[PDB]
Every structure is written in structure tokens, then in C-alpha cells.
Design an enzyme around this catalytic site. Sequence first.
Site, PDB file in Angstrom:
ATOM      1  N   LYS A  32       0.807  -1.211   0.000  1.00  0.00           N
ATOM      2  CA  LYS A  32       0.000   0.000   0.000  1.00  0.00           C
ATOM      3  C   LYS A  32       0.840   1.261   0.000  1.00  0.00           C
ATOM      4  O   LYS A  32       0.485   2.231  -0.665  1.00  0.00           O
ATOM      5  CB  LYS A  32      -0.931   0.017   1.215  1.00  0.00           C
ATOM      6  CG  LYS A  32      -1.545   1.367   1.499  1.00  0.00           C
ATOM      7  CD  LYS A  32      -1.979   1.488   2.945  1.00  0.00           C
ATOM      8  CE  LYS A  32      -3.420   1.063   3.120  1.00  0.00           C
ATOM      9  NZ  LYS A  32      -3.917   1.352   4.487  1.00  0.00           N
TER      10      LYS A  32
ATOM     11  N   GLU B 256      -0.965   7.812  13.819  1.00  0.00           N
ATOM     12  CA  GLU B 256      -0.114   6.814  13.193  1.00  0.00           C
ATOM     13  C   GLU B 256       0.962   6.324  14.154  1.00  0.00           C
ATOM     14  O   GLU B 256       1.422   7.059  15.029  1.00  0.00           O
ATOM     15  CB  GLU B 256       0.526   7.391  11.932  1.00  0.00           C
ATOM     16  CG  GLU B 256       1.298   8.659  12.184  1.00  0.00           C
ATOM     17  CD  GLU B 256       2.766   8.407  12.354  1.00  0.00           C
ATOM     18  OE1 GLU B 256       3.249   7.411  11.793  1.00  0.00           O
ATOM     19  OE2 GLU B 256       3.435   9.190  13.053  1.00  0.00           O
ATOM     20  N   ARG B 257       1.355   5.064  13.984  1.00  0.00           N
ATOM     21  CA  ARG B 257       2.429   4.500  14.788  1.00  0.00           C
ATOM     22  C   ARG B 257       3.754   5.131  14.398  1.00  0.00           C
ATOM     23  O   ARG B 257       4.105   5.167  13.218  1.00  0.00           O
ATOM     24  CB  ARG B 257       2.506   2.991  14.598  1.00  0.00           C
ATOM     25  CG  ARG B 257       1.248   2.237  14.925  1.00  0.00           C
ATOM     26  CD  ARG B 257       1.426   0.769  14.611  1.00  0.00           C
ATOM     27  NE  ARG B 257       0.194   0.025  14.816  1.00  0.00           N
ATOM     28  CZ  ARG B 257      -0.806  -0.008  13.948  1.00  0.00           C
ATOM     29  NH1 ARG B 257      -0.715   0.652  12.807  1.00  0.00           N
ATOM     30  NH2 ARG B 257      -1.894  -0.710  14.217  1.00  0.00           N
TER      31      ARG B 257
END
EC number: 7.1.2.2
Lengths: 271, 158, 316, 132
Positions: free
Chosen positions: C4, C30-31
Site C-alpha cells: 500500500k 499513526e504509529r
Amino acid sequence: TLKDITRRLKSIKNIQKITKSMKMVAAAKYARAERELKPARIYGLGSLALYEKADIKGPEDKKKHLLIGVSSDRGLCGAIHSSIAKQMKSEVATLTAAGKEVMLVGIGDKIRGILYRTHSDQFLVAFKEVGRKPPTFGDASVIALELLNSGYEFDEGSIIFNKFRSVISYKTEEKPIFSLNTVASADSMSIYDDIDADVLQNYQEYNLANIIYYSLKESTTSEQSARMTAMDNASKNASEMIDKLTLTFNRTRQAVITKELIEIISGAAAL
Amino acid sequence: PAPATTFAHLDATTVLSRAIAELGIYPAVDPLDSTSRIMDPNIVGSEHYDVARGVQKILQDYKSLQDIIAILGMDELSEEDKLTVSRARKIQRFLSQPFQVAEVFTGHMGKLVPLKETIKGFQQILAGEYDHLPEQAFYMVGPIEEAVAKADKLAEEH
Amino acid sequence: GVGKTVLIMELINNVAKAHGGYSVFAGVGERTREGNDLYHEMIESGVINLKDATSKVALVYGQMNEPPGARARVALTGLTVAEYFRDQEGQDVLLFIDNIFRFTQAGSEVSALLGRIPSAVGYQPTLATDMGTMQERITTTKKGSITSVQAIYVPADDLTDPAPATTFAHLDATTVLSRAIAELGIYPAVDPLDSTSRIMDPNIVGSEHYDVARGVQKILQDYKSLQDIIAILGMDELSEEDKLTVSRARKIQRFLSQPFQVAEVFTGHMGKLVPLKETIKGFQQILAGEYDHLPEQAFYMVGPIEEAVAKADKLA
Amino acid sequence: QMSFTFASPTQVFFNGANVRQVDVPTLTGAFGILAAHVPTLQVLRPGLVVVHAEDGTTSKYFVSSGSIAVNADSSVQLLAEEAVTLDMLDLGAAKANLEKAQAELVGTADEATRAEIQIRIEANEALVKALE
């Protein structure tokens, strides 16, 4: 209730798994079934080639009768056993109504089960453990032996089976079986030579065995197919129910979250 | 809480169902959820009471069978089970009725079945006197005479 | 599993090249590990340039270890740095939002902290208006346009959950990156049957485009049908058209594969971006039955049909 | 003109194929069937069968117990429960089988079982001479 829907979902899920596996194995068996059917079909029709080329009209006078019904010992195939059942019982009704006694053999535990409380008084013998293994000639030799050792020398007979048309359709067929008396009496048989009571007796016995074998092969096939399509339908319907119950499960869990949140909020607002 | 609380205040509840109305059966009364306090053999008589209880018993049996009927198909039911399903579907259809105020929807003229016609028709459907008629011969009729007439029309035209 | 980040980087590259549009990437919730991974993957693939002024994307990150206010306003920060490009440079900007569900849940946490009464499932009472005041700024004005690619998480796999059900009101297209398609070895692993678009009708893309895409879709559906009927193990050809379409659809579903420029350092294959009309025309040809004599593997990691027939010749 | 259908239950060697002459070992004699043979129906007994093809070459099989039918329409159906080739069979096992068979024969003394042993003996001996 969330847990009720969870339990019912898991049940239908493993049921769908079971039906898919049954469909797979049934198709696997039907492969070999229709592989073996064609040479056996050539064979079992070459046998009847004479009663075709001779036009044995059949006894129009005689009293008794023998009626064989081909099925298996496993249900869950479709309308196979039901079709054989309805044709057999209708035929017995119309023959006993016409003044002709009939006694009935059932190849397959299913047909014996579904017709035993119906016509037990008119019943000769039954056979089991047919349907698990691909039928062979030994099956026919055995059934014919115990058809002859029965001592019931029938005026005439009809075997009823499920002629394999192809993967989707089967037709309940009724094949005729003559006795020594009228195959000897048939004027058409005066064109054949060297024939008397003895050789026609041997030929009739062996053709009984041949037609039983060919019918078993026609019925083993035309059952794995019915089972394969029936299990396809079962798995499809089970997955439809799984989808709808999953919709209802998500609906219920959202409603549960809402209800517990409203409880907590109304409890906090009272302080 | 509002329907649940209302239930205790009534002598004869008549519960309509959406699942029934989606089958086209009107009035969509749920037969297995409508009760009455005079549904008592010492008030309506043993004939009426026994016919009603038998209708409900057969419909309940059909409901309990429905799951495996729609999983495996009807081809796997017992012959007695196929008979109970046949009579149950027939009773389902016979329970529907065209309404005088619903000609705009049903197209049929409204029927007003008196009580004895109801009792007798349902008693006959229970006994098995119509195992030969098609099920669609009972949908939206008056008394059972109209059901037999509709069956005759279906048999002759089709 | 399915690639992705590669699809995102390739969209950035293409939109920067085909049009003149820069891109913004918002990192809502987000991580930090994945943010560092993405930063370095976009530095490696040339979309970000640490030593020149030729970078095609601006990055905005609100990590997971940040208060709900940050994670709730970070998407608006990215939206603002994209709105500048649109309204002051006339560009066609591409705004990515690496997860929109975390935007929704950060708004939920914020409204919970402020003491407001929750709604269905627990989301904020202002869920729809909070999503709307953001998504309504991703539009096509008379000055330019902002096209938004928003990664979506569906909680509990319920597409009727209030968060995805309030986000789907704003979605115009949908691409599904199946791992199943990637196991078949197709890149990009976009599921051609589960990917939807609202502008697919013939009034918008023309009847030619609509009919080519409709035909491709129908042939792929019929190929999956003939596949589950080939599962008979009796692969025969009692139908001429069945195997004809089987090979046509295999050639198609391999022609829906493409070498991306951003993956030019990892694989020797050159990145071939193909115009719209050439795609329509190539799939039109393959649907008309022309390229039958061509083998199957000449329709794999190719650009337009010209490269396909050139490869087919070069197989020998 | 000959419509030959040599067919075991699970195999088919001919089906309507045209051959010039066949030989069959019927219970009441071993004879030959050619075109327009007078209509006959017989049951077989263990032994050879030799199909003469139209091209002259003879395919030899060994049948166990079947049934032959020669109809008015030149159709010749030969249904044999066990059809074989001649390399598919051995000699030592057939010999030993026949030996132990007649041993048990003079051993066995009941009528029906005696007939059974004798039929085993006749099959084994038709086979042993069909051997070599």
C-alpha cells in the site's frame, strides 16, 4: 441476545463447513463413478440388445410379479430415494388392484426403510452396504443368487432405478425382466437356434445378473451427482443465513453498547 | 416498555407481524402470538377450542422445522414431516382474508366469514380433506367453498 | 501485507508528473515506527529529496502518543497545507490520510473529555458535523482541486458502524488492496471486482470508457464463475466460449498489472505510467478477441499493449 | 457386416467394430461366428477367444464365463465377466491351482461342493491348455 446469536452463528458455520466437505468428497467419488459408468453402460445395454431385437412383449396373462428397487444406504442425496419410493408404491398399488400379486426386493437400506412400513406384507428380501463402495459385478452376482435361491420364480419383473441423465437430472426408469416361460413362448425367439429350456435358463439368469449390475452402476452414478449438488445448495443456504445472522449480530452488539452507555450516563447525571 | 406494559391491560391481544406481511398474508396477524381470555373450551366450545389448538400446534411444528427446511431443503424431511409442512402452509394461506377496506390493495372483494364457516374450514384442512389442492388455492379466500372453487379454476385454466 | 505504501508513493509520483500537483500526507494517529518507515521509504524512492528542492510531498504527523486534541487537528493541518497549494497555485493536490477512523476516534475522545454525552456506540454527538467540516474542504474549486485518499479501518468488521457509515457518505471512490490478488502476483494488488467508483456511469466517463470497464468486469466475474466450475477437476472444454473467455480473462487480469516507477530501484522493470485512452484502447482490444495468438506471460508487468506485443515478440 | 461387442463389465474391447470372424467356446461346443450367422444365444465356458480383424490379424483374449448372442441383424454381443490378454496370465500358478484343485477333489466328497471343485478344475485346465 448477543450470546444466543453467537451460538447460532457458530452452529451454522460448522454446519456449512460440514456440507462443503461433503460436497467435495461427493464430487470426488462422482468422478470415478462416471468414469466407470460408460463401459458398464455399453455392457449392460449390449446385454438387453436381444430383448430389444426380439421384442419380447411380456406375459399378458400371468399373476405374480417381482419388483426390485435400486437405491443406497445413505440419505441426504435429494429426491432419489423418494422418487424410487413413490414409483414403487404406486406401481404396487396398481398391480395389486389389477389382481396381480407382487413381492419386492430393495437394494439399499434407504428404500427398505422408507417402504417397509408401507408394504411389509409384500416384501421378499433386502440388501445393505450398497452405496459406500463403488458397485461391482460381485454385487450383482450376489443379488441375483439370492434372487434365484429365493425360490420365488416370478412371472415377470421390473427393476426401478435412477437412470443417470447427467450431473443435474436423473430419471426414474423401470426396466423389464422376463421369466423362462414366456421368453420360451415368445414366437420371436423361434429365429434363434440351439435353444431349449436349459440354455434359455442359463441366459435368463445371467441377464438378470447383468441388468442388476448395470442398474447399480446407473444408480451409484446419479447419486454422487445428486449428493454433490445438494451439498452445494446446503452450503450456499448456510452462508446466506450466516450473512443475515451476522448483520443481526452487529445490530445487536451496537444496541448493547448504546444501552450500557446510556445506563452509565444516566447514572452519572443523578449526582 | 410501552408495548410490554400494555400487554397486561388487555383481554384479547392481536399481534401483527412484519415477517408475515412480507409473505403477502393479510391481515398479518401472528397466529402464534395472539391470545385471548375466552379461548377456553367452556366458553367457545370444545369444537372451536380443539380446532384452534390444532391449528396452532401445526403452525408451531412448521416453525420449528423451518430452519432445516431452509438449510437442507424439504427433500430431507420425513413423509409425516412433509405432510405437516403441507397442511401448515395451507393453514397459513387460509388464515389470510381479503378486506372490504382493502379492495384498493387486494383487488378482491371483501369477505366476511362467519364463525361456523371458519371452524369447519379449518377442521377440514386439519383432517386432511384437501391434501390434493394446491396451496395457492387458499390464499385470500372467504370460506373453504371459495378455496375449492379457486382450486377448480386453477386446475381447469392451468 | 499487500503493498500500500508503494501505491501511495506511485500516486504521488504520477500526480506530480502527469499533472503538476504536489501531495500532502497526514499521519492521523499513526504509529511512530510506521511513520519512520514511511519517511525512509519515501526518501529512498525519490518522492522526498533531502538534498534538493524536488520533493513532491509534504508530511504532517500526529502520532499515537499525542493527546486527543493533536490527533484530532492533525488532519486539518494537512488539509491546510494542501489548501494552500490548491488556492494559491491552481494545482491539483493529492491529500492522503493514513487513517480516517483514528480521526473519528480522536474526535470522540476529545468530545468525551469535554464532558459531552456520547451517542450511538459511544461516538461524539457531533460525529457527522465533525466529519463534514473537514471533508467539505476537500473539494474542486474554480482555482484548483484537492483529491483525498483516505485509508479506512472498519471497526469489528461492521460496515454499518457509525464511523465507517458516516465516512462512506463522503467517499467518491474505493480501492481494495486484496492480499489474495497479491498472492496471485499482481501489482498493484487492487481487487478489480470489489473496487467501486461513483463516476463510472456513462454520463461522466463517456459510453466508451463505461462499456470497456463494464465488459472487463463482466468477463472477470464470469472467469471466477468458470473457475469454481473448473474446480470440478474435470477441466474440459464442452464450451468453446468458456475456455476462450478463461484465457481472455487471464490475459486481462494479468494486464491489470503494472510496473511502478517508485519500484525501479528494487526491480529492474521500468516504471510505465499509461494514459487513460491507451488503457481504454488496450482493454478494448483484449475484449475484442484480437490478442489470442499472444501468449499469457507477455501481459504481465507491462505498460500499454505496444509493450505487450513487443514483449510477446521478444519471448522467442 | 459384423457388429462385435466384446465387453467385460469394467472394460470394452470392441463396440460395433467390424471384424471378419470370431471363435467362441460355448458350453455346447467351440465354434466360429461369421457374418449372417444363424441367430444363436449361448453361455460361455472358460477358454480362449480369437478375434480375426478385417485386416487379417488375430487378437487373442481369454474369457472366463460370459454369454454370446448372434442376432438376425448380424449383431454379435459377447459379454464376458473376465476378459484378459495372454501375457496377463502366468503358467506356474495355473498349474499349481489345478493340482491342488484335483487333490481337494478326490479329497472332497459332497455332491454340490464336488461340482464346484470340478468347475474350478475345468476352468484351470481350459486355462492350462490355453497357456502353452
